Motif scaffolding. Structure first.
Motif, PDB file in Angstrom:
ATOM      1  N   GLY A  28      -0.316  -5.448  -5.383  1.00  0.00           N
ATOM      2  CA  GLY A  28       0.639  -5.699  -6.453  1.00  0.00           C
ATOM      3  C   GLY A  28       0.856  -7.150  -6.852  1.00  0.00           C
ATOM      4  N   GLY A  29      -0.188  -7.964  -6.954  1.00  0.00           N
ATOM      5  CA  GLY A  29      -0.175  -9.273  -7.598  1.00  0.00           C
ATOM      6  C   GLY A  29      -0.643 -10.408  -6.692  1.00  0.00           C
ATOM      7  N   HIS A  70      -0.796  -7.818   1.371  1.00  0.00           N
ATOM      8  CA  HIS A  70      -0.432  -8.120   2.749  1.00  0.00           C
ATOM      9  C   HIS A  70       0.605  -7.180   3.361  1.00  0.00           C
ATOM     10  N   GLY A  71       0.121  -6.409   4.334  1.00  0.00           N
ATOM     11  CA  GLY A  71       0.842  -5.372   5.032  1.00  0.00           C
ATOM     12  C   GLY A  71       0.615  -5.424   6.531  1.00  0.00           C
ATOM     13  N   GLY A  72       0.487  -6.604   7.144  1.00  0.00           N
ATOM     14  CA  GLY A  72       0.321  -6.748   8.592  1.00  0.00           C
ATOM     15  C   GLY A  72      -0.738  -7.785   8.953  1.00  0.00           C
ATOM     16  N   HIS A  89       0.796  -1.223   0.000  1.00  0.00           N
ATOM     17  CA  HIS A  89       0.000   0.000   0.000  1.00  0.00           C
ATOM     18  C   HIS A  89       0.837   1.285   0.000  1.00  0.00           C
ATOM     19  N   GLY A  90       1.741   1.359  -0.965  1.00  0.00           N
ATOM     20  CA  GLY A  90       2.568   2.509  -1.295  1.00  0.00           C
ATOM     21  C   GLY A  90       1.852   3.741  -1.833  1.00  0.00           C
ATOM     22  N   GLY A  91       0.669   4.107  -1.338  1.00  0.00           N
ATOM     23  CA  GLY A  91       0.035   5.398  -1.598  1.00  0.00           C
ATOM     24  C   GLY A  91      -1.383   5.297  -2.156  1.00  0.00           C
ATOM     25  N   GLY A  92      -1.749   4.164  -2.767  1.00  0.00           N
ATOM     26  CA  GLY A  92      -3.148   3.874  -3.110  1.00  0.00           C
ATOM     27  C   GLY A  92      -3.376   3.300  -4.502  1.00  0.00           C
ATOM     28  N   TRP A  93      -2.312   2.939  -5.227  1.00  0.00           N
ATOM     29  CA  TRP A  93      -2.398   2.751  -6.680  1.00  0.00           C
ATOM     30  C   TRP A  93      -1.904   1.364  -7.093  1.00  0.00           C
TER      31      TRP A  93
END
Length: 24
Positions: free
Chosen positions: A10-11, A17-19, A1-5
């Motif tokens: 990303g695949g 998955h970020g936590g 989730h590097g900003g919303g895009w």
């Protein structure tokens, strides 16, 4: 989730998955 895009979901792996929450 590097900003919303193309960094979020990303695949299917470490780009969603970020936590354990709404990222995965």
């Amino acid at each position: 989730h590097g900003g919303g895009w193309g960094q979020p979901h990303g695949g299917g792996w470490g780009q969603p998955h970020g936590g354990g929450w709404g990222q995965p």
